[PDB]
Amino acid sequence: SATMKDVARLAGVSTSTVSHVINKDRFVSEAITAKVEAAIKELNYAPRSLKLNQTHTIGMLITASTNPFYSELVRGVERSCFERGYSLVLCNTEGDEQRMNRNLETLMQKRVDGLLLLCTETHQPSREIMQRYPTVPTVMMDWAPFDGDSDLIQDNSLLGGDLATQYLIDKGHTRIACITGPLDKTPARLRLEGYRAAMKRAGLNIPDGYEVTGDFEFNGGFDAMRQLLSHPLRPQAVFTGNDAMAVGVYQALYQAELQVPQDIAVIGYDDIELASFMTPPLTTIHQPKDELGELAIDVLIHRITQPTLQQQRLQLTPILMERGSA
């Protein structure tokens, strides 16, 4: 005679979070959970580890990009999975939204226990697809394309951009430019904010057009640097929002017949393997990619085994790598 709606009326919470209290498949406040059970009693209402739908498999949806950062991060995740005795299935995704939704749906149809998302820029793989697999937790890496209640594992890019800029300030540069990633991508915005913070703290003015947007790819770095090279007041130094764009920066400087660091100092972000092979080797901010992968897998596995775990939004501190570019 009693339904879940009977329970949720008496309790005064939504039927959807009574279903979460009975299934124990999401985090519910300890308050609410005692009241839902307080209404389950009275109404006498009648409805881990060993699941028919589980496969000991983790899925990961990654962007298609020629930015080595993503491969390096994936490699870290791969290693962590192996070490934890999980198998990892990957799907590249490109193009528009329906393309990206098709790929995600295919991965889910393969019946993974958990999902890692590593997306670029404008990218929303549909909440509608994930809603069709509600028992499957999602952990987002690097940035949250769409927010939500999903766990997030990333570096601290606000601190990162500040470190990079402060480094240049400490080396005596006052005319410091900043090449950003796409500003609708949160890590790019945070790195720009870190740069602004360091400049303000030093009482340094940022000339108009010293902040230039790129695409976090080789080409964006090139286009952005050529723009900066047409500034009447020429920069002494440039914070390039990632190492991929620094590659473009170097190419631009090479064609402009300018030396690094003698004419212009350059500092990147990521510490991709390529950074240490550049000429000169690239001063950059090291993201701990292995630790990020380990942490992401650890969190996802924790949530797989304990659905009620509270949301994790965790930031690892990056480290300046001093080399020859700055």
Which positions lie near a copy of itself, rule CB under 8 A?
55, 57, 64, 66, 68, 71-72, 74-75, 78-79, 82, 87-92, 94-95, 99, 102-103, 106-107, 109-110, 218, 222, 247-248, 250-251, 254, 273-274, 277-281
Q: How many CA atoms lie within 13 A of 122 on its CB side?
A: 4
Q: Which residues contact 23 (CB under 8 A, 6 or more apart)?
A: none
- Torsion angle, alpha carbons of 242, 210, 252, 280, to 10: -60
Binding-site residue total for ligand RIP (CB under 6 A)? 12
Rounded-to-integer distance, Cα 213 and Cα 205, Å: 19
Closest separation in Å from C-beta 64 to a copy of itself: 5
Quote the tokens at residue 305.
């085994």
Residue 239 interacts with ligand RIP (CB under 6 A): yes or no: no
Closest separation in Å from C-beta 196 to a copy of itself: 29
- Give the residue among 219, 216, 266 at the shortest CA–CA distance from 241: 216
Closest separation in Å from C-beta 241 to ligand RIP: 7
Q: Where would I find the beta strands (DSSP E) of the chain?
A: 57-63, 87-93, 114-118, 138-141, 151-155, 176-180, 211-213, 237-240, 265-267, 284-286, 313-316, 319-321
Indicate which single residue of 270, 278, 292, 293 sits in contact with ligand RIP (rule: CB under 6 A): 270
Give which of a copy of itself, ligand RIP, none residue 200 binds (C-beta under 5 to 8 Å, depending on kind). none
Q: Which is nearer to a copy of itself, 18 or 88 (CB)?
A: 88
Q: Where do runs of H (alpha helix) occur along 96-242? A: 97-109, 127-130, 157-170, 186-201, 218-228
Residue 76 interacts with ligand RIP (CB under 6 A): yes or no: no
Closest separation in Å from C-beta 228 to a copy of itself: 17
Indicate which single residue of 125, 187, 221, 248 sits in contact with ligand RIP (rule: CB under 6 A): 187
Q: Which is nearer to ligand RIP, 9 or 286 (CB)?
A: 286
Give which of a copy of itself, ligand RIP, none residue 270 binds (C-beta under 5 to 8 Å, depending on kind). ligand RIP
Indicate which single residue of 181, 220, 261, 268 sits in contact with ligand RIP (rule: CB under 6 A): 181
Q: Which residues contact 151 (CB under 8 A, 6 or more apart)?
A: 137, 138, 139, 140, 299, 300, 303, 311, 312, 313, 314
Give which of ligand RIP, a copy of itself, none residue 229 binds (C-beta under 5 to 8 Å, depending on kind). none
Give which of a copy of itself, ligand RIP, none residue 110 binds (C-beta under 5 to 8 Å, depending on kind). a copy of itself
Residue 216 interacts with ligand RIP (CB under 6 A): yes or no: yes
Whether 49 and 304 have beta carbons less than 8 Å apart is answered as no
Indicate which single residue of 93, 242, 284, 325 sits in contact with ligand RIP (rule: CB under 6 A): 242
Residue 268 interacts with ligand RIP (CB under 6 A): yes or no: no
Q: Which residues pair with 286 in a beta bridge?
A: 270, 319
Closest separation in Å from C-beta 173 to ligand RIP: 22
Question: Cis omega (within 30 of 0) on the bond before 261?
Answer: yes
Distances from the Cα of 175 to the Cαs of 41, 57, 264, 267, in angstroms?
69, 50, 10, 14
Residue ranges that bind ligand RIP, judged by CB under 6 A: 67, 69, 142-143, 181, 185, 187, 216, 242, 244, 269-270
